[PDB]
Amino acid sequence: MIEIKDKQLTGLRFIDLFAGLGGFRLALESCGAECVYSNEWDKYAQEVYEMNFGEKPEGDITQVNEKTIPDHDILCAGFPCQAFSISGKQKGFEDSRGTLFFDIARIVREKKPKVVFMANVKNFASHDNGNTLEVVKNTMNELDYSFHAKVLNALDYGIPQKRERIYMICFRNDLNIQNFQFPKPFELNTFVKDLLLPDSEVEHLVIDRKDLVMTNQEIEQTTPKTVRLGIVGKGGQGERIYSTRGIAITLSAYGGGIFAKTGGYLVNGKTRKLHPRECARVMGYPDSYKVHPSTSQAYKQFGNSVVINVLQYIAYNIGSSLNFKPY
DNA sequence: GATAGCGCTATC
DNA sequence: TGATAGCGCTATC
Ligand SMILES: Nc1ncnc2c1ncn2[C@@H]1O[C@H](CSCC[C@H](N)C(=O)O)[C@@H](O)[C@H]1O
């Protein structure tokens, strides 16, 4: 994550729904905002959350009375995406884990925050011929909020990861906000290898399969893109080796393959998956962040989390707009 | 809970 | 296309 000297969000209080690791909290807190409520039902995520913020999020949101939610200016939510990802069986709202957005809708209806900050996967914008995004636009417009939506790639904001996500920002109409903009991308000067840990600490992650087929030459010069070098087995998800000289592929939460949830990388002549901490760095988390003791769970948590840096630039721009109030 | 083969989708 | 990539799915122990 980045350091922020002008706390555009000072004095403002927010809600951390579908918290997970608390990526949103880190981002809004670095801008001066105050977290007044957090919600996350996964036992393990809850443990990491406490392990890093002292508190334990509330259980199943679908069964929490919105009236209960503390007043807040900004509502943060990176709701479930298994139901909309390019990787899943796109059952959208028909999927049990696909209706959570409507829970946000009722939270908003009751609490009417000044801003609604949401995030989901890219395939979300086009899912079901775009009808899914439309339901969210109209549902938000019908609650009387503007709807600013856009897809950004982390590689465009200082983090070497091809993670492309859609960010939805909603302001309450009454407060006429018309200068809000998404962060302009800027050159990527950081690559996978710049974030790796010393070999002595990742020896155990080294994999060595006889079906390893290097199909491409290691790259000398760095690029702001993922560059496949080889493959293992059939080369499906988690069976592809990439260059640490390029950027990292999208981390996943339920992903499989020998290099499950992180992908394979070629480091000093060896083939291995990323270390939970390297994942953290890939997601923009400060090394001071305590990861969960269970690696499988840690990989999962970082897998469906958010890139703090990106979240920061948006959060900063949310404050810039909220603060511009001339006479 | 942890591990890992997959198998289909979207993009251009 | 043909090649690449995905907050995934789920069977097994
Ligand atoms: N009904 C429900 N109540 C609370 N959390 C839920 C939920 N259904 C799904 N979730 C949680 O939704 C989260 C989606 S992942 C969101 C990650 C988050 N922005 C971060 O930075 O970590 C998961 O952690 C999942 O456990």
Indicate which CATH number applies to the domain containing A207: 3.90.120.10
Q: Which atom of ligand 1 approaches the CA of A42 most closely?
A: 26
Same domain, A171 and A270: no
Rama region for A34: left / alpha / beta (φ>0; ψ in -120 to 50; rest): beta
Q: Which atom of ligand 1 approaches the CA of A253 most closely?
A: 15
Same domain, A30 and A123: yes
Same domain, A24 and A95: yes
Give the structural domain span for A229: 187-284
Same domain, A169 and A195: no
Cα-to-centroid distance, A286 and ligand 1 (Å)? 21
Residues in chain A: 327
Closest-CA residue to A321 (of A202, A180, A189, A206):
A180
Residues 6+ apart with CB under 8 A from A167: A117, A118, A119, A149, A150, A151, A152, A182, A310, A314
Any atom of strand C under 7 A from CB of A24?
Answer: no
C chain positions with any atom within 7 Å of a protein CB: 4-10
Same domain, A162 and A64: yes
Q: How was this structure determined?
A: X-ray
Same domain, A301 and A280: no
Tell the residue nearest (CA) to atom 5 of ligand 1: A40
Quick check: A238 and A256 in contact, CB under 8 A? Answer: yes
Cα-to-centroid distance, A260 and ligand 1 (Å)? 20
Same domain, A265 and A209: yes
Residues 6+ apart with CB under 8 A from A190: A158, A159, A160
CA dihedral A301, A304, A310, A311 (to 10 degrees): -70
In chain A, how long is the greatest CA-to-CA distance? 71
How many structural domains compose chain A?
Answer: 2
Strand partners, A272: A206, A265
Q: Residue A163 belongs to a domain with what CATH number?
A: 3.40.50.150
Residues 6+ apart with CB under 8 A from A97: A80, A82, A83
Q: Where does ligand 1 bind, in terms of residues with CB under 6 Å? A: A 18-21, 23-24, 39-42, 45, 60-62, 78, 80, 100, 304-306
Same domain, A18 and A87: yes
Which residue's C-alpha is at the least distance from the C1' of C6?
A: A87
Catalytic residue list of A: 81
Quick check: A99 and A59 in contact, CB under 8 A? Answer: no
Closest-CA residue to A318 (of A177, A186, A184):
A177
